[PDB]
Amino acid sequence: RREIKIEGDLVLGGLFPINECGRINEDRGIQRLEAMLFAIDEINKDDYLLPGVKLGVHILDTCSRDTYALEQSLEFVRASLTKVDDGSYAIQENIPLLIAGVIGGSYSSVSIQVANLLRLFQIPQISYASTSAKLSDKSRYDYFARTVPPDFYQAKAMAEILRFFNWTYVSTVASEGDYGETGIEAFEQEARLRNICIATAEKVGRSNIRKSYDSVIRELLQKPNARVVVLFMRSDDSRELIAAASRANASFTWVASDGWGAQESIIKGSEHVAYGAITLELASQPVRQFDRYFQSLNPYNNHRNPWFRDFWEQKFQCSLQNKRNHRRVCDKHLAIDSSNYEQESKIMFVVNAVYAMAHALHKMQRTLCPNTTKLCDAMKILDGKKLYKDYLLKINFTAPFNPNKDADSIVKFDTFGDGMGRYNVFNFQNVGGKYSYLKVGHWAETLSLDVNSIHWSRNSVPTSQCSDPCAPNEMKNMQPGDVCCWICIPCEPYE
Amino acid sequence: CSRDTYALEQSLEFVRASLTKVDDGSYAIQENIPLLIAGVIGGSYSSVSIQVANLLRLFQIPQISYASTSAKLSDKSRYDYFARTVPPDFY
Ligand SMILES: *[C@@H]1O[C@H](CO)[C@@H](O[C@@H]2O[C@H](CO)[C@@H](O)[C@H](O)[C@H]2NC(C)=O)[C@H](O)[C@H]1NC(C)=O
Numbered sequence: 001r002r003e004i005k006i007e008g009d010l011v012l013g014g015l016f017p018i019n020e021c022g023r024i025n026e027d028r029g030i031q032r033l034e035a036m037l038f039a040i041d042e043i044n045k046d047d048y049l050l051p052g053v054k055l056g057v058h059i060l061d062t063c064s065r066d067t068y069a070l071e072q073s074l075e076f077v078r079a080s081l082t083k084v085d086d087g088s089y090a091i092q093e094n095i096p097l098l099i100a101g102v103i104g105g106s107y108s109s110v111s112i113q114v115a116n117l118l119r120l121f122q123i124p125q126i127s128y129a130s131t132s133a134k135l136s137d138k139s140r141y142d143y144f145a146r147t148v149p150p151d152f153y154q155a156k157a158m159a160e161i162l163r164f165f166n167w168t169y170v171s172t173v174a175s176e177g178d179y180g181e182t183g184i185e186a187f188e189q190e191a192r193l194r195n196i197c198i199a200t201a202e203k204v205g206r207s208n209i210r211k212s213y214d215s216v217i218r219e220l221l222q223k224p225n226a227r228v229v230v231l232f233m234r235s236d237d238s239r240e241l242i243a244a245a246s247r248a249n250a251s252f253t254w255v256a257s258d259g260w261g262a263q264e265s266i267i268k269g270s271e272h273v274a275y276g277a278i279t280l281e282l283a284s285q286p287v288r289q290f291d292r293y294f295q296s297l298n299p300y301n302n303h304r305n306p307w308f309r310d311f312w313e314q315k316f317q318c319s320l321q322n323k324r325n326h327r328r329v330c331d332k333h334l335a336i337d338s339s340n341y342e343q344e345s346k347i348m349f350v351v352n353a354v355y356a357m358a359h360a361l362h363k364m365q366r367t368l369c370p371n372t373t374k375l376c377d378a379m380k381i382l383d384g385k386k387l388y389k390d391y392l393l394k395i396n397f398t399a400p401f402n403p404n405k406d407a408d409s410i411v412k413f414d415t416f417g418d419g420m421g422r423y424n425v426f427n428f429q430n431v432g433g434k435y436s437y438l439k440v441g442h443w444a445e446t447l448s449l450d451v452n453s454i455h456w457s458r459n460s461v462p463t464s465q466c467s468d469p470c471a472p473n474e475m476k477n478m479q480p481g482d483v484c485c486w487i488c489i490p491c492e493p494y495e
Numbered sequence: 496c497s498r499d500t501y502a503l504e505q506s507l508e509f510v511r512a513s514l515t516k517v518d519d520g521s522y523a524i525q526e527n528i529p530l531l532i533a534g535v536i537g538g539s540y541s542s543v544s545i546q547v548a549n550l551l552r553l554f555q556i557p558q559i560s561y562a563s564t565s566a567k568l569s570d571k572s573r574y575d576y577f578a579r580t581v582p583p584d585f586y
Contacts, residue, residue, distance in 0.1 A: 070553060074514055081511045089521035113553075120503065120550050140573060 001072075002306035004037075004059035005097070008044070009052075009375050010361060012354065013076045013102030013125075014059025015114060018307050020236055021063030023314065026265050028106075028235060030311045031294065031344045032128070033059060036103060037304065038293045039351045043358050050362050052373030058097055062110050064206075064236060069110040073117045076102060080121050099123060100382055101357045101392075105146075105350070107234050107259075108132035108179030109206070115144040122384040124392050126357050128350040131258055131282070132179045133186060136416045143388055145417030147352045148282050151179070152186040153421035154258055157280055157443050158230060159190035161255065161425065164447055165228075169197050169466035169485050170255070171220050172230035175237040176203035183257065184232045197466070197484055199226040204237055213244030221250060223484075228464035230255040239266045246273035253462045258282060262345050262426055262437050271435065275428055276457020283424040283442060284348050287401060291343055295336040342436070345424075348400075352411055355400055360391035367391075393417055421445075429455035502543040506550045509535065513554060532556055538579070541565035548577045 004014065014036060018029040036059070043055050060072035079096035101124040104114045111130035118125050119142065127135070127146035135141050136150045162170060170191075174184035184201065191198060200223065202216040220229055231254050233241060238260045245252070253276035260266065260279045267274050299320065302308045313319050318330035364387050368378040399409035408420055422444055426437040441449035456462065466485030470477035477486035496502065512529035537547045538560035545568060551558045552575060560568070560579040568574045569583045 074553075078514045078518065081507060081514060084507075085511070086524070086526035087520040088523045091520035091524035093519035093524065116549070117553055120546075 001075075002061060003072075003075075004057060004304065004306070006040075006057045006304070007097060008054035008056030010054075010100040011056035011058050011097040012040070012357060013099045013104060013123075014057055015062050015069065015072070015102065015104035015106060015110065016059065017064045017106040017110075018061045019063050021061075021065060021068065024307060024311055026311070026315055027263060027342075027344050028129075030305075030307065031347060032105070032350050033305070034294050034297065035287075035290050035347045035350050036354055038290050039354045043354070049355075049358055050365065053361065053365060053375065055358065055361075056097065058099060062106050064107055064110065064234075066109050066113050069106075070113050070117060073102075073104075073114045076123075077117060077121055080123075098382060100361060101126065101384075101387070103128070103350075103353050103357065105129045105353075108135065108182075109177055111135060111144070111146075112141070112178060115141045119143045122388070124357070124360075124384055124388040126353040126392070128353045129258075129346050130179075131183075133182050134178060136418060138416060143384070145388075145392060145413060147349050147356065147411065147413075147419045148346075149421035150416075150418050151183040152190075154280055154282075154423065155183055155187035156190050156445075157423050157425075157447075158187050158232075158255065158257065159194050159196065160443070160447050161278060161280070161449070162191065162196050162228075162230070163194045164449060165461065165464075167196065167228050167462070167464045168469075169199060169226050170228045170230055170464055171199035171223060171226045172255075173200075173202040173204070173216055173220070173233070173241070174231075175233040175259070176205040177234065179234060179259070180232055180237075184230075187230065187232060199223045199484055204233075204241060206234065206237065208240075210240070210244060210247075213241050214248065216241070217245050217248050217250055220252070225466055226464050227458075227462040228253055228255055230257075231260060232257040234259045235261070235263060235266055238263075242267055242270050242274055246270045251275070251457065253277065253457045253464075254279075256280065262424075264340075264342065264436055267428070271428070275430075276462065277428045279426045279428075279437065280443075281345050281424050281426065282349065283422045284345050285401070285404060285406060286343050286345070287348050287351060289401075290347060290351065294343070295341065297336070349419075351400060355397070356395050356411055357392065359395050359397050360387060363391045363395070425449060427454050427456075429453075497540050497543065499542045499546050502537075503546050503550070506547045509556075510550060510554065534559070536561065538562045538581075541568070544568060544577075544579075545574070548574045552576055 016029050016033045017025050040057050062069040076099050079098045082096050104125050105128040108130045111127050115125055125144050131148050131151050133151040135144050174180035200219050204212045229252050251273055254274050256277050256279035261281045299309050299312050318328045319326045369376040399406045402409040424439050425441040427440045440453055470486045470488045475488035475490045512531050535558045537558055539562050541563045544560045544563035548558050557576050564581045564584045566584040568577050
């Protein structure tokens, strides 16, 4: 098992989808991990926020799998269990560092398992990308918080997106799991609220053979009238479904979600099959300081990561001197600046999370041990319950880069420990052949799309809507075998 | 102690064996090695049974109550590995 363990006065837990158990995640995982460690270094180098407290880290692979993430969550937990616990001469083995607070994120299912295992140890947990509405509940997940808004706000944004184009008749597909099911249920409720019908609902499983996805594709083609499919999937399932839909001679205008996000590697090599896609993302503002820090990184100056070598040899497809015969050997001048490095949108969220935790600790330090800037007897024992309930949940500090224009500088949690609901909408339009996303609008509660800048798939507004609003006042509506939508029959003038 | 927190600590005492094997002394590290529990009989007060069931769910260790009649434990979602020879409370 590969880990990161940097010791200090206090240590934060690190949960990321570094691997996909499979292959290394290139954007979601490693950029977020580097950002977290960068913020940790900034904390351990500054002088106004925990100056005398050196903040360490313990970061572990999740593989986007419940059982595996649970095993490294148990690795986090071992520290509190070993406290009550001998040896003939000296028994060290591994010394599990006492985690002050776990910055645990990635998908919703992993975060829910981590919250379940950490609630029993009253260890605070801050997420950065998990957005399931289930985690808003405090009955089972009281000690869970996150700087991202819950799922049902995103579902409401999706329903508004649908009703802006009058897409009354749409299909939808979600990933079989807690996140996909919960979010798609919320979005379907919003759709029935806005009188926006649905065609089909399909589930593919968090991990499945390439038999479910093509069946879902055939189901989506079983209703040609519905040119719009609402996709609410996790990132890996989105990748698999896009690959499957490209396998068949098919295309659509995919209404995507946060799991799709502004991700490029998900659609890698498959621009056409998802060209008119509409994707929502939790709006943010990237950090230039992290940009320069991350670009300054090299495998020679980065021994802090067990994966950075494999990350480099995957992203650039060139092997180091380890083998030198698989594909190629990296030149000595390889870099990141001009290369295809678009830092993930959800980086600053990650960073904010850590700082929130840091500030909480700072406030707790200013309360438990205000006489000195030390981890004295009052503070050397972590009061996770009190830390979470009195410092974490109530944290009101300006954004780390309020010098940059940010009306939403205040990181203010709701009563349930969630962030502001403020989203960006993207379409995968063409710019230069190797085209990418760019912002087509923003949303707080009222849409701000721009139809002109959409540049749709079939060079035209998708008319995924079914026949017409039947207007029974002049022609009544009937559903012979078409339960979804209606067909009009001109009512008699004498009836 | 008919308490959630104290029974939770002894539940940890149950649990602080699984993480031991996966975890190197100078000569030996063995004072009182806890044993992995094939199955836990834990019951009486409902809150205690719920907390112990939450802890055991993460370890697929079956837990059988003997008196906790709470219908909340009837929920097999978060109390999957739970069982009880006592009927639920709605009766
Ligand atoms: C969605 O449907 C509504 C009405 O059902 C459209 O609203 C009208 O559209 C006509 C042209 O089709 C305009 O002349 C009117 O100004 C609109 N009136 C009202 C009260 O809305 C709406 O345009 C449709 N949205 C899109 C993108 O086509």
